[PDB]
Write a protein that binds this DNA or RNA. Structure first.
Ligand SMILES: O=C(O)CNC(=O)C(=O)O
Ligand SMILES: [Mn+2]
Ligand SMILES: [Zn+2]
Ligand SMILES: [Zn+2]
Ligand SMILES: [Zn+2]
Length: 418
DNA sequence: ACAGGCGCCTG
DNA sequence: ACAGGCGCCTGT
């Protein structure tokens, strides 16, 4: 749509686009309803060189941290190299520091932990391990190791639609065994949160939100939420889960992912130093040498203030499995280094530090992203809980696509009698 | 090409 | 507890 594209980064506008960074501020000021220092914009440069440890596990090289209590909205923008059009600068990440009420976040942290640690059924995903399938970033204790728990509806290759095509009364929030009371409590928590987060999605990313509500009245059984405007279809809970570098390839194109962060009780004040902390990382990006307004000194001031933490290399002892985890059916200590990624200035690794009750928005299908491993993961008392709300592709059929499935296999009855 | 996935169903 | 069915698409 311009006469100015390959490895400039993925191109999309449904989070926000404009001719320059100043135009982005006008948009974000109009969306959020405030002006000035409440909105913070950081320029990030796409390099395409993935930051990773010597074992291939997520690392951060720069940490964007909330500057002050006056900073309410954080926006990461990408200036597409060599573009002078009206989409030369696009938005790739939005972070509402004060996303949900803190009493709700305090309450959700303990309830989801206690429910999921006891009755939760673990969902094994590809990003749970590094590429050699031998890391131990989640921890090796099966009772305490970090884990992913997915709920709602999901896309299925066997139906090219919702996985509940053959499910009479599907259990969107299934827990171990058959405990309807406990599943109802978990359902109410995540349904209330989907309901609360929906208007925030619409306010700050209206174009992407509008794309996810297009077929709301055609396939309501594949949507979450209890009020009009239901952009989410599935939700995943991540308890001390180290998501290795990945894209969420099942998500619907031109959509986005909303992540609500809940943190351990030792990491709930602004001016505090927690014992451990999980970060959300964009491995293909470096930070700019300049701030939103084009000042080098403002960027250098943020680095010395801590608003942009410039990390250095590390060498830590980690565990590596003696046998890779099998696709579909002991250990030894090893040094994991990071010096190689820090010696190359163009190797990426821009992270944000999500706070208790914050809400993060990003197009997780297009942008490579990851979460750092915890020093001592423990899903019974996790450092970080992330609730990831998304809508998968081909989720626009009523009743989980039941009518299309039995119509497809009714065609087999016609082919059978031949 | 092609390995491998935020699966659930009947029997 | 199990076996076997239903098969799409993306990064590379
Ligand atoms: O937890 C986060 O911040 C990001 N989570 C994911 O990307 C995921 O679970 O797929
Ligand atoms: Mn993800
Ligand atoms: Zn790992
Ligand atoms: Zn252009
Ligand atoms: Zn469904």
């Amino acid at each position: 749509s311009c006469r100015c594209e390959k490895d400039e980064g993925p191109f999309y506008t449904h989070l926000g686009a404009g001719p320059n960074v100043a135009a982005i501020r006008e948009i974000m000021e109009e969306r959020f309803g405030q002006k000035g220092k409440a909105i913070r914009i950081e320029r990030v440069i796409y390099t395409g060189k993935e930051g990773k440890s010597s074992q291939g596990c997520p690392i951060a090289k720069w940490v964007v941290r909330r500057s002050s209590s006056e900073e309410k909205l954080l926006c990461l923008v990408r200036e597409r190299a060599g573009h002078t059009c009206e989409a030369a600068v696009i938005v790739i990440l939005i972070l509402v520091w004060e996303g949900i009420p803190l009493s709700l976040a305090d309450k959700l942290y303990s309830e989801l932990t206690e429910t999921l640690r006891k009755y939760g059924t673990l969902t094994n995903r590809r990003c749970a391990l590094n590429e050699e399938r031998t890391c131990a970033c989640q921890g090796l204790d099966p009772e305490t190791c970090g884990a992913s728990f997915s709920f709602g509806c999901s896309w299925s290759m066997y139906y090219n639609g919702c996985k509940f095509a053959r499910s009479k009364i599907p259990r969107k929030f299934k827990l171990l065994g058959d405990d309807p009371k406990e599943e109802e409590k978990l359902e109410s928590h995540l349904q209330n949160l989907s309901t609360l987060m929906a208007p925030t999605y619409k306010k700050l990313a209206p174009d992407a939100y509008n794309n996810q509500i297009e077929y709301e009245h055609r396939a309501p059984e594949c949507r979450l939420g209890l009020k009009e405007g239901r952009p989410f279809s599935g939700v995943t809970a991540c308890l001390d889960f180290c998501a290795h570098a990945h894209r969420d390839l099942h998500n619907m194109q031109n959509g986005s992912t909303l992540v609500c962060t809940l943190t351990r009780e030792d990491n709930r004040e602004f001016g505090g130093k927690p014992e451990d902390e999980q970060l959300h990382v964009l491995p293909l990006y470096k930070v700019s040498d300049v701030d939103e307004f084009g000042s080098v000194e403002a960027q250098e001031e943020k680095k010395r203030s801590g608003a942009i933490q410039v990390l250095s290399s590390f060498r830590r002892k980690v565990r590596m499995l003696a046998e890779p985890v099998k696709t579909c059916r002991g250990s030894d200590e090893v040094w994991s280094d990071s010096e190689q990624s820090f010696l190359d200035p163009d190797i990426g690794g821009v992270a944000v530090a999500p706070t208790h009750g914050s809400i993060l928005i990003e197009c997780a299908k297009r942008e490579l992203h990851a979460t750092t491993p915890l020093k001592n993961p423990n899903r019974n008392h996790p450092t970080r809980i992330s609730l990831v709300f998304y809508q998968h592709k081909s989720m626009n059929e009523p009743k989980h696509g039941l009518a299309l499935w039995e119509a497809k296999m009714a065609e087999k009855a016609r082919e059978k009698e031949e």
